[PDB]
Amino acid sequence: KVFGRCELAAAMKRHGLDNYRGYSLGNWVCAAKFESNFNTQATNRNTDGSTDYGILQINSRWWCNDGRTPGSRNLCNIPCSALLSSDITASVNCAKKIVSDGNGMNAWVAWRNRCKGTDVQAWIRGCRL
Ligand SMILES: [Cl-]
Ligand SMILES: [Cl-]
Ligand SMILES: [Cl-]
C-alpha cells in the first residue's frame, strides 16, 4: 500500500507513535517519506546481506526474521514480511522498540541525514489529526 501523507500521519497517531519517545508525528512521517516514499512494500538489500523492510525500512540484522541474514537477531519477534502489510501495526510496534534502543531516531540514518533538525511539522501540515 502506498499511503497518502496525511493518511499515514493519522495511522501512525492511531497506533501511538505521535510523540513516542519525544518524537513528534512529523518526525515519523518525514522518516517514512525518505525511507520508503510511504510504500509499505518497500524492500532494500544492504551491503552486509541484511534487508530493510516496509514503511520505515526496518532491518533484518537486528529486528525481524527473514531466514537469509546470517548471525542476525529478531528482536521484534516477527517475520520481516509482516513489515510489508497494508496494516502498519507491526511496523509501528517494532519502531517503538527500535527508537527506545538508545540512539533514538538516529537508528534511521535517513532520518538523521534528511529530517533531523528540519521543519518536520511541515509533514503533517494541513492534516486533520
Ligand atoms: Cl511535527
Ligand atoms: Cl536469518
Ligand atoms: Cl541518507
**Could you tell me the distance, in angstroms and rounded to a whole number, from the CA of residue 30 to the centre of ligand 1?**
9
Fill in the amino acid letter for 68.
R
**Could you tell me the distance, in angstroms and rounded to a whole number, from the CA of residue 34 to the centre of ligand 3?**
8
Q: Choosing from 7, 18, 48, 52, which is the catalytic residue?
A: 52
Question: Which DSSP letter does residue 87 get?
Answer: S
* Backbone φ, ψ for residue 101 (5° rounding): -80, -10
How many domains is the chain partitioned into structurally? Answer: 1
Active site (annotated) includes residue 35:
yes
DSSP 52-82: EETTTTEETTTS-B-S-STT---TT-SBGGG
**Could you tell me the distance, in angstroms and rounded to a whole number, from the CA of residue 52 to the centre of ligand 2?**
13
Q: Which of 65, 9, 64 is nearest to 32 (CA)?
A: 9
The sign one gets for the Cα dihedral 102, 47, 68, 40 is positive
Residue range of the domain that includes 62: 1-129
> Angle 3-9-12 (CA atoms, 0-180°, nearest 5)?
95
Strands of the 43-45 sheet, one edge to the other: 43-45, 51-53, 58-59
Task: Scan for cell 496494516, then name that residue.
Answer: 87
Experimental method for this entry? X-ray
Q: Which of 5, 34, 11 is nearest to 92 (CA)?
A: 11
Q: Which of 42, 67, 72, 37 is nearest to 54 (CA)?
A: 42
- Cβ atoms of 112 and 106 within 8 Å: the answer is yes
Within a 13 Å sphere around the CA of 84, how many CA atoms are in the beta-carbon half? 13
Which ligand lies nearest to the CA atom of residue 119 in the structure?
1
Question: Which DSSP letter does residue 86 get?
Answer: S
Q: Which of 122, 114, 82 is nearest to 95 (CA)?
A: 82
CATH of the domain at 3: 1.10.530.10
Within a 13 Å sphere around the CA of 94, how many CA atoms are in the beta-carbon half? 30
Burial class of 64 by CB neighbour count within 10 A (0 to 12, 13 to 18, 19+): buried
Q: Choosing from 7, 35, 87, 119, which is the catalytic residue?
A: 35
Active site (annotated) includes residue 52:
yes
Task: State how far Cα 67 lies from the chain centre.
Answer: 21
Bridge partners (DSSP) of residue 59 are 52
C-alpha cell at 45: 538489500
- Cβ atoms of 78 and 96 within 8 Å: the answer is no
**Could you tell me the distance, in angstroms and rounded to a whole number, from the CA of residue 109 to the centre of ligand 1?**
19
- By DSSP bridging, strand 58-59 and strand 51-53 are antiparallel
Task: Scan for cell 505521535, then name that residue.
Answer: 18
Distance separating alpha carbons of residues 18 and 23, to the nearest angstrom: 7
